[PDB]
RNA sequence: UCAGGACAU
RNA sequence: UCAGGACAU
């Protein structure tokens, strides 16, 4: 686990092919971005309990 | 690339073994989390350039 | 901004 | 907002 501050505007990191973009706020809502290859899977925490469940490709 | 809006105590997912916590915000800071293995690299986009200098993991 | 592989900025 | 593998919340 990790925790750690950034503002709109500024970038975090993950492995060697993933990189975050605060893009801004809006109220309580906050926009975010995320780039990574297609060789790896990225969801809201809703979406990914439907594929945790036994995948990462429908029917 | 992907965006999302979503906002504080939201959660957001990568690969198979990563996940993402928005913790709050602070005018425009932004406290966030993040979960993931040690067999991976997490850091914010400062201390990124110290490890894409010739590296992955520190000593 | 109700969910996408797009900064719609 | 100070930099860590910790929600210090």
Redesign the pocket.
Known sequence: ???????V?ES?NIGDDITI?I??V??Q?V?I????????????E???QRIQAGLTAPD
Chains 1, 2 share one sequence.
């Open positions: 686990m990790l925790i750690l501050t950034r503002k505007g975090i973009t893009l801004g809006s109220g809502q926009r971005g995320i780039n990574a290859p297609k060789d790896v899977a990225v969801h809201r809703e979406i990914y």
